[PDB]
Amino acid sequence: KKYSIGLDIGTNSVGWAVITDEYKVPSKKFKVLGNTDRHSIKKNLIGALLFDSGETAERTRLKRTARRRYTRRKNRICYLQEIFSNEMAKVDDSFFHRLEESFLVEEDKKHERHPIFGNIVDEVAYHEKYPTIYHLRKKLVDSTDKADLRLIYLALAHMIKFRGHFLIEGDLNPDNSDVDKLFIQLVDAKAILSARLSKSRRLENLIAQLPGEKKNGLFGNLIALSLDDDLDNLLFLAAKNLSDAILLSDILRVNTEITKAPLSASMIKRYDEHHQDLTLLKALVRQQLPEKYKEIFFDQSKNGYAGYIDGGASQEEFYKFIKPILEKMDGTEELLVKLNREDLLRKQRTFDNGSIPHQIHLGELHAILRRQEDFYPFLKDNREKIEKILTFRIPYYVGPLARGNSRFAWMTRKSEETITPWNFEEVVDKGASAQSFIERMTNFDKNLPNEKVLPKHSLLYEYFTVYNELTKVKYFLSGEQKKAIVDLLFKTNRKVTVKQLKEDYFKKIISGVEDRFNASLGTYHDLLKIIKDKDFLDNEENEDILEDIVLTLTLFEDREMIEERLKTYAHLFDDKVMKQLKRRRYTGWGRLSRKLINGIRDKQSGKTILDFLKSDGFANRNFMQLIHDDSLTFKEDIQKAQDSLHEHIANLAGSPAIKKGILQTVKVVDELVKVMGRHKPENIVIEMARENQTTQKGQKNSRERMKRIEEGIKELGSQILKEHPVENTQLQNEKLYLYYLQNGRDMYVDQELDINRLSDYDVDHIVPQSFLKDDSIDNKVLTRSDKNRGKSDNVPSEEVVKKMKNYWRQLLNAKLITQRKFDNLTKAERGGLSELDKAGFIKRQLVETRQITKHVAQILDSRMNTKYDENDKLIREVKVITLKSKLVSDFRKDFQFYKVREINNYHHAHDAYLNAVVGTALIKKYPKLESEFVYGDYKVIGKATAKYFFYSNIMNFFKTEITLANGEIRKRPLIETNGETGEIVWDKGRDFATVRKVLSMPQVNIVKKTEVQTGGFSKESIRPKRNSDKLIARKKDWDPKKYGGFLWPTVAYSVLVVAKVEKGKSKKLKSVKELLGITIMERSSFEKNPIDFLEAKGYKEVKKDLIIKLPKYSLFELENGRKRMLASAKQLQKGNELALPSKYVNFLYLASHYEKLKGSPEDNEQKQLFVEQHKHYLDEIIEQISEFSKRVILADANLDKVLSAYNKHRDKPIREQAENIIHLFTLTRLGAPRAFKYFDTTIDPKQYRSTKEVLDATLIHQSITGLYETRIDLSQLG
RNA sequence: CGCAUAAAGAUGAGACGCGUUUUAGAGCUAGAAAUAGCAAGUUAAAAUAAGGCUAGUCCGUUAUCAACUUGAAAAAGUGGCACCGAGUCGGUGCUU
DNA sequence: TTGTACTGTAGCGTCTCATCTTTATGCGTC
DNA sequence: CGCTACAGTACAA
Ligand SMILES: [Mg+2]
Ligand SMILES: [Mg+2]
Ligand SMILES: [Mg+2]
């Protein structure tokens, strides 16, 4: 009758179990549908549901942004062609048409095969004249001759298409501020521009050039002018010119030849040194090592020069290949020092070109347009249009430019015209769109869902924070006393401690708070420092306009928008002080609204709740009481302020990977309720990933990072805080925190970093994001940009480890970086990335599973109890119970119910059953702890330490004998009782045998969730041309036999077809039954009309009613109970579970972890002799694995290999042997076959690359719990 | 639940630099040639999920998804119990 | 001409802006 | 709180 359900929830598994009051799992005879002979099957009410973990929308967002970028770049090119078309039709009408067909082959082109000029000799002359596009760019910038319009279009389209970063907001003119000769009109900067640019080097070299008459006041070449509102005093012009000079000359090599195109000059310089070094290297290789010439300059697969140009070898790979060849030869000293500087044989389109700003291209484009405006009037007519096309960028607060058909757009448009960069200002309403950029994202108030929350830096919200912490301060404080302490302490100090309170108010004019007050009026002090009017802030009438000021400052960050919103209030303030106020940027919003805290008033008292916090007589209630006190009128107002399950999950925001676990466990609960005849359970047990730790441990794990930086710098004895002071709240920034963690020095290059130019530096992940998802502090490293651009899909190389291993140790012993961070940095010493590094759990699954279990508690408590009364707010029909994993782990570790995850997927169901058993025993044994453990209820040395001790000692009733902390045992009798009632709640007799029997049960309903695969169509790598037909066409008109294409298509689901295929030169319709893979591209076309799609594949007389959709992980059953999961249409997977007996599992868990039990020496000796007397269990386990493999795995050669390896190493110690048998279950583990390894030998997987046997097998349609099945025998079809 | 300090992650927008693919950048000589010697190599165009229609400088890899009967779809409905045992579940007995 | 066996292959590095979450500790609260 | 299908080449019929 009565029963309980226990659940274990992971990111890939949902374990479920049903128990009665006797801790027994029921078994039922379930009906079986389908055409098979079986009509009833006995199944136990215990199992687990396995599924692929849900994916976050990060990758989809990156692909979407890339798609938008490509679309807008093509639109920029289209705008430029639209401008140029009228004049281009005069000189070459087919020119843009030839540029469009440049991808096509000779037969597919509709014009001459030469794109630019349409004939061989002119194209050859053009390429001889300009080897690169940069030669043409420099020629158009510098020369004054009238050039061909096609070359002008080529240059302009080159800089428009590839336009450089927009991280610099100033002008940074390269026409005259480029050259370092600004010093003579300042009073060269060449010295530090050759050396390392840093404050100390600038100071010492400035003293070296000129012993200063004023150390901080030299008025020229100072670090203040190198590294707009600060001009209120009136060296400014020369200061900004020298700043632009030092920045541009850091980006680009110097150009003493005067030109307006420094970038093209630097690229031509790279080309010239590349040509010279190539010729010299060819001569030296031919003269010294003639045998290596063929390998280096012809073999393109050996990372040589042919591999550097024609092959896929990068610059780093080519350098590390060619360094031994260069060092073993003679006369290669300068080439060696160029290779050390990474300046040898460089290309132009390199990885480090991301540092180049868009202003250089803007200057070059402006120079070309100024040169060519006289000859071509239309260039001068719309020079501003071309400049706008190059320089326009959609603001991030506007978003996509949709017309109401995008689920991501929030833009509103004033008019209905098409948006171009020229008329973007007169069409798009930037103010409302900028408002909606923040309003669409900030959350609503929980108590008032209908209206938005306040900013955190609101003055009203800060008065809230103060009086809400203060109202429970006891020495209760009266309202006059609270007013006085606020006036004399909170309005006078940004941070107030209890000592300042004691020695400033109570001395002349405490429990409930610790050493410092959490509440402060930071915004009040900021406006005191800005406005310089305490009376204006203290006035009550101007509260709403101050709130509008805070809202305006928080919503907007652009200067023009802030000034546009701020112009209404300009007649109370002076122009200098709104100019100073508009610099105050606010980020962060509060947890409460304006109406809930100061708009609503009590019906009888008439006060706002903030007034209630200011003065509550002697009661001194806070918001929690004031919303849960029935006497005030706030509770029913909040209550008045307050259908498919898919809708109950559609409205819950957050990561989409929580929805998979939520939906699976709720549907499992629903089906389990349906199975037992619509009878609701007594209580439902939820695995909670929460814990309880010591107060000291929790405070150590939650201390300020500012203290960590202080101890690290003090251990290293650095003075970076003396030069660069900082607070704790300024370390919330990622880049500043990583700069301070590395003591202002770059981690990959031995140089001092610049604190004021962190935007040009990159946050590298030591383990690549392409390899494994890990955004921890142990992985993040701040470094200069070009090095991180070079570290594409790689751990930093061996050379930087040998260079800077001393500094890594220096920071490691300074307690600034952890041991894991050092191991990541020194990963290249151990072989770098490998398959073993790929394995192991990651913390993202932990965070997602915590979110999932919290939502499990909420949704299950909402769904299960759907009844209430007028006096009883909810009838607790079902009690949702959340135990912590520690209690179940201790239950496993104290009564020898060990689990290992390597053997089978039964551990999920066993953990769920143990959850149910422990939860029911705990609620039955202590009904006074019902309100503690059941969700929705509440009971109302450190407190956390006391809670940890109480949760540690609560399980002591399970044990037969309890050993106290003094080493003395205690007696607790075998049969437990409820205490208040003589009811039996735990027997240390029959119930332990029952739980042993359940944990040894062989049949557990393990179900792999069948999913239709969705995602990318194929792998992103575009493969070269070939005669194979497996190449996927990259476009409709692009035949992959000529143009190449993608490979490895992903199939959505497989389809069983029964039709005829014309086989033989004498055509005859032979009937055939086979699986066909429906790829993701063909999914829509197949579901549109399956018959015509199958007819186009060569089939005919297709039995339409016989088509069975077979998604991935579809289950088939064959002889001797052998089951294969359909991985794809051409691949199967292992689908059987090995039910090893519990004694063998306990023996394996005790044999492994041989000397790391950390229990007691008597227990360690007990396990010592226990594993010693039963060493024959290894042979029994090998026999069991061999029998299971011969029955179901059908990998005979690998079986002989593992048997020979076990026989040859049977004299090894028990630790290593048992560890390798733990590794051995990978052969028999359900899922894809994987390559495991024994002691020394490595066993390659046996792949099941044949789906012929499942065409005559028994297809199983398992439900969400697998109890309801529909077996289909496919041999009766066709 | 609010405030404060952690840590690990989510959602959305604007951008950059590469990479890949085909074509253009006349290869020369000895050559019956299979080939061999020599020369050259750095750049550009186009595409960057096939595409879709509400045609937007928009959207297209997230989430949802056992089988059967109704329903365009959404959605709804569909499967006996007790006992004795256990190699992926079996056997025995009542029930309509 | 069609199945099997063994080995290799797979898109990548950031920058600037916003807002959130669930766990851990110190205070009040139900 | 987990963890490969497809490509390409070489042999058996
Ligand atoms: Mg990186
Ligand atoms: Mg689990
Ligand atoms: Mg999906």
- From CA A987, how far away is CA A973, in angstroms rounded? 10
Q: Could you tell me the resolution of this structure in angstroms? A: 3.1
Cβ proximity of A1245 and A1228 under 8 Å: no
Please identify which residue in the block is written with the tokens 């002071």.
A725
Contacts of A56 (CB under 8 A, 6+ apart): A655, A656, A657
Contacts of A167 (CB under 8 A, 6+ apart): A357, A759, A760
Sign of the torsion angle spanned by Cα atoms A233, A237, A239, A244: positive
Ion ligand 1: residues, CB within 5 A, are A 764, 788
Is residue A776 located within the same domain as residue A884? no
CB proximity A908–strand D (7 Å threshold): yes
Q: What letter represents residue A1235's amino acid? A: A
Token pair, residue A971, equals 């007696």
CB proximity A513–strand C (7 Å threshold): yes
Listed by the residue before each break, gaps in chain A with C–N over 2.5 Å are 187, 227, 234, 475, 509, 642, 940
- From CA A1168, how far away is CA A252, in angstroms rounded? 70
Token pair, residue A636, equals 């029913």
C1' (B53) to CA (A403) span, angstroms: 14
Q: How many CB atoms lie within 10 A of CB A1037?
A: 8
- From CA A52, how far away is CA A1009, in angstroms rounded? 8
C1' (B55) to CA (A418) span, angstroms: 12
Token pair, residue A746, equals 């770059």
Cα angle A265-A271-A273, degrees, rounded to a multiple of 5: 100
- Side-chain half-sphere of A701: how many Cα atoms within 13 Å? 7
For residue A1120, count CB atoms less than 10 angstroms from its CB and return exposed for 0-12, middle for 13-18, buried for 19 or more.
exposed
Determination technique for this PDB entry?
cryo-EM
Annotated catalytic residue A111: no
Judge whether A874 lies within some domain. Answer: yes
- Residue numbering of the annotated binding site of A: 8, 687, 691, 908, 1209, 1240
In chain A, positions 1238-1267 with C-beta closer than 7 Å to nucleic chain C are: 1244, 1246-1247, 1249-1250, 1252
Ligand at minimal distance from the CA of A796 is: 1
Is residue A820 located within the same domain as residue A852? no
Cβ proximity of A1023 and A1046 under 8 Å: yes
Cα angle A710-A714-A715, degrees, rounded to a multiple of 5: 120
- Residue numbering of the annotated binding site of A for Mn(2+): 8, 687, 691, 908, 1209, 1240
Q: Which DSSP category does A486 fall into? A: I
Determine the distance separating the centroid of ligand 1 and the alpha carbon of A674, expressed in angstroms: 51
Kindly list the distances between the CA atom of residue A15 and the CA atoms of A345, A1216, A1265, in Å, as whole numbers in the listed order.
Answer: 60, 31, 10
Token pair, residue A1093, equals 């799609």
Please state the domain count of chain A: 7
Contacts of A1208 (CB under 8 A, 6+ apart): none
Q: Which DSSP category does A162 fall into? A: S
CA dihedral A246, A249, A251, A256 (to 10 degrees): 170
Ligand at minimal distance from the CA of A60 is: 3
Smallest Cα–C1' distance to nucleotide C24: which residue has it? Answer: A698
- From CA A319, how far away is CA A745, in angstroms rounded? 26
Is residue A326 located within the same domain as residue A459? no
User: Three-state SS for A435?
Assistant: helix
Is residue A881 located within the same domain as residue A964? yes
Determine the distance separating the centroid of ligand 2 and the alpha carbon of A139, expressed in angstroms: 68
In chain A, positions 878-907 with C-beta closer than 7 Å to nucleic chain D are: 885, 901-902, 907
- From CA A424, how far away is CA A290, in angstroms rounded? 63
Determine the distance separating the centroid of ligand 2 and the alpha carbon of A1108, expressed in angstroms: 32
Is residue A852 located within the same domain as residue A831? no
C1' (B46) to CA (A146) span, angstroms: 29
C1' (B84) to CA (A463) span, angstroms: 73
Q: If we measure between CA atoms, which residue out of A885, A626, A640, A869 comes closest to residue A9?
A: A885
User: What phi, psi does A330 have (nearest 5°)?
Assistant: -115, 150
User: What phi, psi does A412 have (nearest 5°)?
Assistant: -120, 140
CB proximity A1020–strand C (7 Å threshold): yes
Q: Which of A969, A999, A1029 is the last residue of a domain?
A: A999
Is residue A745 located within the same domain as residue A600? no
Q: How many CB atoms lie within 10 A of CB A1158?
A: 7
Is residue A579 located within the same domain as residue A628? yes
Q: If we measure between CA atoms, which residue out of A1120, A1224, A1245 comes closest to residue A1182?
A: A1224
Judge whether A18 lies within some domain. Answer: no
CB proximity A168–strand D (7 Å threshold): no
Kindly list the distances between the CA atom of residue A459 and the CA atoms of A482, A583, A613, A1186, in Å, as whole numbers in the listed order.
Answer: 17, 18, 15, 74
Determine the distance separating the centroid of ligand 1 and the alpha carbon of A775, expressed in angstroms: 11
Q: Which DSSP category does A55 fall into? A: P
Determine the distance separating the centroid of ligand 3 and the alpha carbon of A1032, expressed in angstroms: 22
Contacts of A863 (CB under 8 A, 6+ apart): A645, A666
Q: How many CB atoms lie within 10 A of CB A609?
A: 26
Q: Which of A361, A366, A765, A910 is catalytic?
A: A765
Q: What letter represents residue A940's amino acid? A: V
Q: What letter represents residue A707's amino acid? A: K
Give the DSSP per-residue string, A985-1053: --BSSHHHHHHHHHHT-S--EEEEPPB---S-SB-S--BPP-S-S-PEESSSS--HHHH-EE--BPEEE
- From CA A359, how far away is CA A168, in angstroms rounded? 8
- List chain B nucleotides near protein: any atom < 7 Å from a Cβ: 1-26, 38-51, 54-68, 74-76, 79-92
CA dihedral A374, A380, A386, A387 (to 10 degrees): 90
Kindly list the distances between the CA atom of residue A679 and the CA atoms of A663, A671, A672, A912, A1276, in Å, as whole numbers in the listed order.
Answer: 21, 11, 10, 20, 39
Determine the distance separating the centroid of ligand 2 and the alpha carbon of A685, expressed in angstroms: 14
Q: Which of A972, A999, A1026 is the last residue of a domain?
A: A999
- From CA A689, how far away is CA A9, in angstroms rounded? 9
User: Three-state SS for A513?
Assistant: coil
Kindly list the distances between the CA atom of residue A1211 and the CA atoms of A1150, A1168, A1173, A1218, A1220, in Å, as whole numbers in the listed order.
Answer: 19, 18, 16, 12, 13
**Buried b / exposed e across A244-266, counting CB within 10 Å, b at 16+?**
bbbbbbebbebbeeebbbbbbbb
Kindly list the distances between the CA atom of residue A1057 and the CA atoms of A275, A1091, A1110, in Å, as whole numbers in the listed order.
Answer: 62, 10, 11
Please identify which residue in the block is written with the tokens 């000293």.
A333
Judge whether A602 lies within some domain. Answer: yes
Token pair, residue A242, equals 């020298």
Which nucleotide is nearest to A1023 if distance is taken from CA to C1'?
B21
CB proximity A1244–strand D (7 Å threshold): no
- From CA A187, how far away is CA A139, in angstroms rounded? 35
Kindly list the distances between the CA atom of residue A1014 and the CA atoms of A64, A1007, A1017, A1089, in Å, as whole numbers in the listed order.
Answer: 16, 20, 8, 20
C1' (D2) to CA (A52) span, angstroms: 9
Token pair, residue A1188, equals 């299971």
Domain encompassing residue A218: 180-227+235-251
C1' (B86) to CA (A27) span, angstroms: 12
- From CA A893, how far away is CA A911, in angstroms rounded? 13
User: Three-state SS for A1117?
Assistant: strand
Is residue A817 located within the same domain as residue A948? no
User: What phi, psi does A388 have (nearest 5°)?
Assistant: -65, -40
- From CA A279, how far away is CA A264, in angstroms rounded? 23
C1' (B6) to CA (A697) span, angstroms: 12
Please identify which residue in the block is written with the tokens 């760019």.
A137
SS3 per-residue string spanning A593-626: ECHHHHHCCCCCCCCCHHHHHHCCCCCCCCHHHH
CB proximity A557–strand C (7 Å threshold): yes
- From CA A706, how far away is CA A314, in angstroms rounded? 41
- List chain C nucleotides near protein: any atom < 7 Å from a Cβ: 2-7, 9-30
Ligand at minimal distance from the CA of A782 is: 1
Kindly list the distances between the CA atom of residue A32 and the CA atoms of A37, A346, A527, A1113, A1126, in Å, as whole numbers in the listed order.
Answer: 9, 70, 75, 20, 22
**Buried b / exposed e across A693-730, counting CB within 10 Å, b at 16+?**
eeeeeeeeeeeeebeebeebbeeeeeebeeeeebeeee
Smallest Cα–C1' distance to nucleotide B3: which residue has it? Answer: A518
Alpha helices (runs of H) in A119-261, residue ranges in sequence order: 120-129, 133-142, 149-161, 183-186, 190-194, 199-209, 236-251
Alpha helices (runs of H) in A826-905, residue ranges in sequence order: 835-838, 843-864, 885-894
Judge whether A598 lies within some domain. Answer: yes
Q: Which of A582, A617, A641 is the last residue of a domain?
A: A641
Token pair, residue A74, equals 């093509």
Determine the distance separating the centroid of ligand 1 and the alpha carbon of A764, expressed in angstroms: 4
- From CA A44, how far away is CA A47, in angstroms rounded? 8
User: What phi, psi does A783 have (nearest 5°)?
Assistant: -150, 165
Is residue A860 located within the same domain as residue A932? yes
- List chain D nucleotides near protein: any atom < 7 Å from a Cβ: 1-8
- From CA A889, how far away is CA A108, in angstroms rounded? 69
Annotated catalytic residue A97: no
**Strands A1108-1111 and A1068-1079, sheet pairing:** unpaired
Q: How many CB atoms lie within 10 A of CB A585?
A: 10
Determine the distance separating the centroid of ligand 2 and the alpha carbon of A657, expressed in angstroms: 16
User: What phi, psi does A418 have (nearest 5°)?
Assistant: -70, 135
Is residue A243 located within the same domain as residue A384? no
In chain A, positions 312-371 with C-beta closer than 7 Å to nucleic chain C are: 354
CA Rg value for chain A: 37
Determine the distance separating the centroid of ligand 3 and the alpha carbon of A1113, expressed in angstroms: 14
- From CA A575, how far away is CA A548, in angstroms rounded? 18
User: Three-state SS for A17?
Assistant: strand
Smallest Cα–C1' distance to nucleotide B1: which residue has it? Answer: A624
Determine the distance separating the centroid of ligand 2 and the alpha carbon of A846, expressed in angstroms: 12
Judge whether A551 lies within some domain. Answer: yes
Q: What letter represents residue A138's amino acid? A: K
CB proximity A1111–strand D (7 Å threshold): no
C1' (B41) to CA (A793) span, angstroms: 27
User: What phi, psi does A474 have (nearest 5°)?
Assistant: -115, 145
C1' (B14) to CA (A226) span, angstroms: 29
Sign of the torsion angle spanned by Cα atoms A610, A613, A614, A615: positive
Helix (H) / strand (E) containing A1128: strand A1123-1128
Kindly list the distances between the CA atom of residue A1098 and the CA atoms of A1086, A1094, A1101, A1106, A1255, in Å, as whole numbers in the listed order.
Answer: 14, 7, 10, 17, 20
Contacts of A614 (CB under 8 A, 6+ apart): A467, A479, A482, A483
User: What phi, psi does A499 have (nearest 5°)?
Assistant: -70, -40
E-state strands within A661-752: 683-688
CB proximity A755–strand C (7 Å threshold): no
Kindly list the distances between the CA atom of residue A1154 and the CA atoms of A322, A903, A1175, in Å, as whole numbers in the listed order.
Answer: 50, 19, 14
User: Three-state SS for A50?
Assistant: strand
User: Three-state SS for A478?
Assistant: coil
CB proximity A965–strand C (7 Å threshold): no
Is residue A563 located within the same domain as residue A465? yes
What is the side-by-side order of every strand in the sheet holding A1114-1117?
A1131-1134, A1123-1128, A1114-1117, A1258-1260, A1272-1273
Kindly list the distances between the CA atom of residue A900 and the CA atoms of A917, A1150, A1243, in Å, as whole numbers in the listed order.
Answer: 20, 11, 22
C1' (B46) to CA (A155) span, angstroms: 17
Please identify which residue in the block is written with the tokens 């409709």.
A1036
Smallest Cα–C1' distance to nucleotide B9: which residue has it? Answer: A844
**Buried b / exposed e across A503-523, counting CB within 10 Å, b at 16+?**
ebeeeeeeeebeeebebbbbb
Contacts of A99 (CB under 8 A, 6+ apart): A115
Smallest Cα–C1' distance to nucleotide B20: which residue has it? Answer: A1022
Kindly list the distances between the CA atom of residue A545 and the CA atoms of A236, A451, A1072, in Å, as whole numbers in the listed order.
Answer: 37, 19, 80
Judge whether A1137 lies within some domain. Answer: yes
Judge whether A1036 lies within some domain. Answer: no
- From CA A188, how far away is CA A439, in angstroms rounded? 52
Kindly list the distances between the CA atom of residue A945 and the CA atoms of A697, A948, A995, A1171, in Å, as whole numbers in the listed order.
Answer: 9, 5, 32, 37
Smallest Cα–C1' distance to nucleotide B25: which residue has it? Answer: A127
Determine the distance separating the centroid of ligand 1 and the alpha carbon of A770, expressed in angstroms: 10
Sign of the torsion angle spanned by Cα atoms A251, A255, A261, A264: negative
C1' (D2) to CA (A841) span, angstroms: 7
Is residue A460 located within the same domain as residue A601? yes
Judge whether A708 lies within some domain. Answer: no
Beta bridge partners of A455: A589
- From CA A891, how far away is CA A385, in angstroms rounded? 75
